[PDB]
């Protein structure tokens, strides 16, 4: 009768999920989290909806290597290690890195085709597990979207013109309008209003 599960507020779960989805955008978080995406042209990586109908593992890995997940797919299966400790004989014998998350809107073979590929996890846009999106509570999973998945995301989480399709839900507000304060500080309205600055290391008088 120890507490094993922990209740989280549903709206705070949705907050964390939405911030995880937003962190699967710009590539600094994806590089800092792991995820060899330095030779990827643009994040989000959205591929065509024909991926969801691929039902061979060989064709699926050809598609992932062709759209650019080759070095991440090689980071997994070269990171397979025997687990340090007593966990290795508690059915937790090998550890490996996380591969890409392939996120789809409808499943026509892609789940089973990418099932056997190490590191690679698949997901429906209807769900989007936070355990998959920010594993180890590190933001910025490498995510390959299909076009249908990317379109359906606007209906699953809402916008300024689509509500949310979750009951009562709105995406969270911002308490600050920009995330980089240096251009607010070097804006002309603050700079013309502030006094001149000093030496930035004071002279040692006396």
């Amino acid at each position: 009768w120890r507490k094993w599960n922990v209740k989280v507020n549903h709206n705070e779960k949705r907050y964390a999920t939405a911030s995880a989805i937003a962190a699967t955008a710009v590539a600094s978080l994806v590089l800092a989290r792991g995820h060899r995406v330095e030779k990827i042209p643009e994040i989000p990586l959205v591929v065509s909806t024909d991926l969801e109908s691929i039902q061979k593992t060989k064709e699926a890995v050809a598609a992932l290597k062709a759209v650019g997940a080759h070095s991440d797919l090689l980071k997994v299966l070269k990171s397979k290690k025997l687990r340090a400790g007593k966990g290795k004989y508690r059915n937790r014998r090998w550890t490996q890195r996380r591969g890409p998350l392939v996120v789809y809107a409808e499943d026509n073979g892609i789940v089973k085709a990418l099932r056997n590929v190490p590191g690679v996890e698949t997901a429906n846009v209807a769900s989007l597990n936070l355990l998959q999106l920010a594993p180890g509570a590190h933001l910025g999973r490498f995510v390959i979207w299909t076009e249908a998945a990317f379109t359906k995301l606007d209906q699953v989480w809402g916008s300024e013109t689509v509500a949310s399709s979750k009951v009562g839900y709105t995406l969270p507000s911002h308490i600050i309008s920009t995330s980089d304060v240096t251009r607010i500080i070097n804006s002309s309205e603050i700079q013309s209003a502030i006094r001149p600055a000093g030496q930035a290391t004071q002279k040692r008088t006396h």
Binding site: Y89, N91, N116
Partner: protein, 126 residues
Amino acid sequence: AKQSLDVSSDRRKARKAYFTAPSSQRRVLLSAPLSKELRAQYGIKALPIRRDDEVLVVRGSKKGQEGKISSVYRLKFAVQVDKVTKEKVNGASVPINLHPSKLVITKLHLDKDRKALIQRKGGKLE
């Protein structure tokens, strides 16, 4: 990945099921692959191993040696192949235990049950 709730990924259970297997289960467990010639001839890849089979060792320190399997020692999970011996210092000759997965069958002992086994696995029997 496992898909059925009947088989076990438990390492302890798998090792008890290996080390406490009866001999009729150890016969299947002590399988041995065929050679390139026999795999082309019989269309199948591996068979349970027999006494009068001719084998080539392809691993370990006696690799590349030939012989007939003198004994299938299922209690030790081993096969004893003649011409593959250890000369002791008193002049005695003891058989070296080999595992059949490190062997390659180069000639089968065929009888009616082996022929039916090959045909059951889909073999050409040629």
